Amino acid sequence: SRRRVVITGMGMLSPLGLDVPSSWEGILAGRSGIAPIEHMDLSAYSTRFGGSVKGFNVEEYLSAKEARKLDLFIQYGLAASFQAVRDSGLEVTDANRERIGVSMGSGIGGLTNIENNCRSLFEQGPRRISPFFVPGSIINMVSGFLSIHLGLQGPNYALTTAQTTGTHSIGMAARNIAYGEADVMVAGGSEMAACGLGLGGFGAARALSTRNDEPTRASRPWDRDRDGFVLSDGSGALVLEELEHARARGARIYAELVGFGMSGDAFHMTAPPEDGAGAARCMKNALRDAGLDPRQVDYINAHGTSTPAGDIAEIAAVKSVFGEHAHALSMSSTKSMTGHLLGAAGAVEAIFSVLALRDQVAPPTINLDNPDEGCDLDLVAHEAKPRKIDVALSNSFGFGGTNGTLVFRRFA
Amino acid sequence: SRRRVVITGMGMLSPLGLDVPSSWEGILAGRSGIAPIEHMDLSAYSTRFGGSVKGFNVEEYLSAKEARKLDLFIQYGLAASFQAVRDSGLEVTDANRERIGVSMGSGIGGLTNIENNCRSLFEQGPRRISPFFVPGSIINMVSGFLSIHLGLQGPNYALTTAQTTGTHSIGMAARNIAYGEADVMVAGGSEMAACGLGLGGFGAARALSTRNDEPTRASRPWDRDRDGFVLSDGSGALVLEELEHARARGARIYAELVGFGMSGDAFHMTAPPEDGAGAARCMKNALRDAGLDPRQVDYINAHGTSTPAGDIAEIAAVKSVFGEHAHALSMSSTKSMTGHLLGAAGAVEAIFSVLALRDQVAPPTINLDNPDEGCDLDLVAHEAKPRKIDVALSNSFGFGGTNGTLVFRRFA
Numbered sequence: 001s002r003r004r005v006v007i008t009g010m011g012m013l014s015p016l017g018l019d020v021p022s023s024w025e026g027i028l029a030g031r032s033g034i035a036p037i038e039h040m041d042l043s044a045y046s047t048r049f050g051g052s053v054k055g056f057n058v059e060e061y062l063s064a065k066e067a068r069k070l071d072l073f074i075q076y077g078l079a080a081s082f083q084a085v086r087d088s089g090l091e092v093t094d095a096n097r098e099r100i101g102v103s104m105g106s107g108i109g110g111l112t113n114i115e116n117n118c119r120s121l122f123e124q125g126p127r128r129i130s131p132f133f134v135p136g137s138i139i140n141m142v143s144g145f146l147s148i149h150l151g152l153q154g155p156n157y158a159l160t161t162a163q164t165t166g167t168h169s170i171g172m173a174a175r176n177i178a179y180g181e182a183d184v185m186v187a188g189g190s191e192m193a194a195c196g197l198g199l200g201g202f203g204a205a206r207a208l209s210t211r212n213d214e215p216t217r218a219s220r221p222w223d224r225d226r227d228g229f230v231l232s233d234g235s236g237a238l239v240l241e242e243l244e245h246a247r248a249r250g251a252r253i254y255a256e257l258v259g260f261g262m263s264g265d266a267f268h269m270t271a272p273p274e275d276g277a278g279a280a281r282c283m284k285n286a287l288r289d290a291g292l293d294p295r296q297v298d299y300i301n302a303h304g305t306s307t308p309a310g311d312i313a314e315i316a317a318v319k320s321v322f323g324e325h326a327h328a329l330s331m332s333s334t335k336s337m338t339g340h341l342l343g344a345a346g347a348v349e350a351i352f353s354v355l356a357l358r359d360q361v362a363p364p365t366i367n368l369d370n371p372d373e374g375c376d377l378d379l380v381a382h383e384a385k386p387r388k389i390d391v392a393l394s395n396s397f398g399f400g401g402t403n404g405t406l407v408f409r410r411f412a
Numbered sequence: 413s414r415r416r417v418v419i420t421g422m423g424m425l426s427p428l429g430l431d432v433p434s435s436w437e438g439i440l441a442g443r444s445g446i447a448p449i450e451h452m453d454l455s456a457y458s459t460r461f462g463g464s465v466k467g468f469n470v471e472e473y474l475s476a477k478e479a480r481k482l483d484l485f486i487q488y489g490l491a492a493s494f495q496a497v498r499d500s501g502l503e504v505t506d507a508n509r510e511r512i513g514v515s516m517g518s519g520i521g522g523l524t525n526i527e528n529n530c531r532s533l534f535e536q537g538p539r540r541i542s543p544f545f546v547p548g549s550i551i552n553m554v555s556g557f558l559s560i561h562l563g564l565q566g567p568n569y570a571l572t573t574a575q576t577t578g579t580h581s582i583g584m585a586a587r588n589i590a591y592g593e594a595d596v597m598v599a600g601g602s603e604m605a606a607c608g609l610g611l612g613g614f615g616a617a618r619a620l621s622t623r624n625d626e627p628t629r630a631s632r633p634w635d636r637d638r639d640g641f642v643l644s645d646g647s648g649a650l651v652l653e654e655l656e657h658a659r660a661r662g663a664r665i666y667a668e669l670v671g672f673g674m675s676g677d678a679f680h681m682t683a684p685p686e687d688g689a690g691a692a693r694c695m696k697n698a699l700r701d702a703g704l705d706p707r708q709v710d711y712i713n714a715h716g717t718s719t720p721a722g723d724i725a726e727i728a729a730v731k732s733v734f735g736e737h738a739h740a741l742s743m744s745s746t747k748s749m750t751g752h753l754l755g756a757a758g759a760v761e762a763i764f765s766v767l768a769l770r771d772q773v774a775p776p777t778i779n780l781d782n783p784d785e786g787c788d789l790d791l792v793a794h795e796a797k798p799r800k801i802d803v804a805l806s807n808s809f810g811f812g813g814t815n816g817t818l819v820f821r822r823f824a
């Protein structure tokens with residue numbers, strides 16, 4: 001028998017807010033966080049908008065001198081991590097520091113910093129590269145810096161599974177705890193790929209919406225006029241904790257993490273199978289892991305990226321796993337409002353699923369004006385829907401056909 | 413509960429060879445794979461040599477049309493993976509495809525492809541960025557592409573823990589199998605960071621040997637005249653398999669994976685603690701996980717990077733863990749010959765530890781002409797040493813204070 005894993009702290013930066021409550025208020029209000037990007041010249045680019053973190057002050061977390069050593073994706077991950085630990089009320093001691101670890105990841109990592117160092121290298125040569133370039137850019141430095149700042153000596157690692165990172169990081173941190181390798185883990189993801197190589201890279205593959213004239217309507221999952229995903233920045237972190245450890249210190253418990261599934265499509269480098277067969281195996285794996293019947297699922301936070309192929313494949317997977325119950329559950333994409341935070345998408349979407357359980361409200365899919373052929377489920381179009389939610393599922397699918405599913409249940 | 417995990421296949425690209433047998437021959441001969449770098453002009457750099465993969469032909473594995481879209485680290489990862497799956501004799505079928513996954517990691521990933529696309533962006537513009545930029549450069553796509561080519565539908569992910577990547581990848585893939593998430597995993601790492609940004613960034617940190625006049629003598633772990641690590645390229649992959657699954661099909665078993673340790677130092681972004689406190693915690697976790705008496709350890713494949721602080725912290729950790737027995741075991745650094753493959757270092761060094769068990773020989777630490785103060789263990793100076801080896805341990809330490817230990821033993 002495994003130990004049980006509960007959520008006792010959450011932290012976030014998103015295009016809707018600098019913490020969880022501000023973000024969640026934007027989610028329930030149906031607000032968009034998408035705007036034209038201000039921090040660079042995008043004249044030559046086919047996409048000029050995305051979800052930026054507005055008003056972030058790294059000096060609430062680090063000295064200006066510490067912060068100069070670290071890429072934005074690392075600053076964002078540290079901010080979500082410090083928020084989640086504070087939110088949990090956990091006290092790190094000599095008695096428990098070896099039982100507390102970190103799994104914070106990223107899809108694309110230190111693109112901005114690499115881009116800024118390339119400028120210096122071609123302009124002036126290698127003498128102008130920062131001494132902190134390597135440690136300040138590598139994906140495991142959110143886990144490393146957090147562990148150094150807080151004295152965490154438990155398992156210390158980072159996942160990178162592109163758009164699935166946040167979901168895999170959380171699920172494998174839950175495994176660490178379930179099988180007794182740690183009592184507490186800080187887990188999630190962070191991303192800041194709005195540089196030329198990000199917008200340019202995804203733009204070259206024709207993956208991005210180009211609705212430059214109306215950025216707030218660009219992200220429209222399952223709508224007949226969708227034209228690709230919206231690139232967004234930010235971070236999510238959750239304090240995962242063994243149940244008996246949480247109860248002993250009187251921790252506030254948001255929800256229980258009951259299931260985790262993984263699968264590979266083994267199909268294509270960027271496209272899903274049109275029946276979403278890998279996403280179907282993943283969800284069934286997560287439900288078998290939790291000991292749940294499909295009929296017990298009330299709410300799905302979809303991957304729902306606003307791509308032609310992805311959105312439909314996910315409807316097919318849900319119809320196949322849930323049969324008739326596909327028309328009773330509610331499913332929405334919060335990416336209609338946040339855009340796609342890539343490696344952080346699963347971390348902020350885990351937090352939205354947990355708060356959907358806490359508040360007993362399904363977040364809306366905004367911009368769902370004309371649902372496409374076969375998109376006939378309850379996708380919570382336009383407006384938040386209060387409803388009963390005992391079980392919430394969160395899905396992430398990524399480049400390489402790598403899939404993750406998390407199942408959260410109410411804890412009483 | 414926990415199932416046992418064995419090694420049934422191995423694969424490698426290194427500075428010593430284009431497969432496992434050729435690389436291992438070089439190891440037991442005391443041959444250096446370090447040479448002046450040919451593929452670019454380094455006259456502006458303080459380090460002008462390293463361990464390149466010499467004479468690699470990707471058209472032994474993949475069409476030139478596919479290879480053109482993939483960073484070298486992906487090419488190197490696929491080559492090692494294809495060798496390991498063939499070496500295992502495993503047949504992938506509809507009956508087992510959902511039970512075979514992959515965890516191939518990298519420390520920095522597609523830095524050469526990123527540097528080339530940065531040139532295009534700055535010298536020309538974003539219209540010249542490759543449509544294959546993202547899927548040809550991001551770390552999770554060795555796992556991605558390998559699943560696509562072989563039809564692997566099991567757990568599909570990637571670790572990024574800097575110089576610890578290869579050791580954590582193998583260790584967490586063994587956990588997947590032990591706990592029933594998969595019956596087979598392809599696990600290890602790949603690196604190719606030998607571009608301007610890579611040599612420049614490690615250069616800016618003064619981390620690299622500048623022994624340009626004698627490259628084969630630069631990597632000299634525990635020697636008094638060491639002056640930093642040597643940057644090297646390549647990949648290691650291993651087929652991990654549940655014991656009864658391996659027995660059922662009549663697999664050739666190289667060794668058993670009995671122990672895995674993780675720990676965080678929580679000390680510094682890049683420097684080890686002088687007493688090797690985090691390495692010592694990590695090795696003790698691994699030895700308890702394996703159900704062993706520390707006096708059972710016959711051979712240690714050291715991290716042994718040839719840095720002033722790293723090499724001596726590692727002696728201190730070994731003396732603390734093993735006491736008087738630290739004088740009876742043999743410890744060596746294969747980095748003396750290969751240099752530091754970073755994210756792949758733990759993967760090739762796991763394979764070198766397994767072959768030390770098959771052939772009952774400790775690989776040499778070459779270049780160890782004048783051992784430093786307190787470096788008075790058996791460090792197998794100059795020449796390979798045949799001896800009894802029932803238990804072999806492989807250590808990796810990384811930036812962020814991330815630590816990993818693998819314990820292997822002989823199997824009936």
Ligand SMILES: CC(C)OC(=O)c1cc[nH]n1
Pocket residue numbers: 269270271272273276278279303309310311313314317397398399400401402
């Ligand atoms: C991103 C792509 C590889 O996957 C999807 O969009 C998807 C949707 C349902 N299953 N996979």
Ligand SMILES: CC(C)OC(=O)c1cc[nH]n1
Pocket residue numbers: 575681682683684685688689690691715721722723725726729809810811812813814
């Ligand atoms: C890579 C660096 C942070 O750590 C080491 O070299 C080391 C040696 C013993 N403990 N850690």
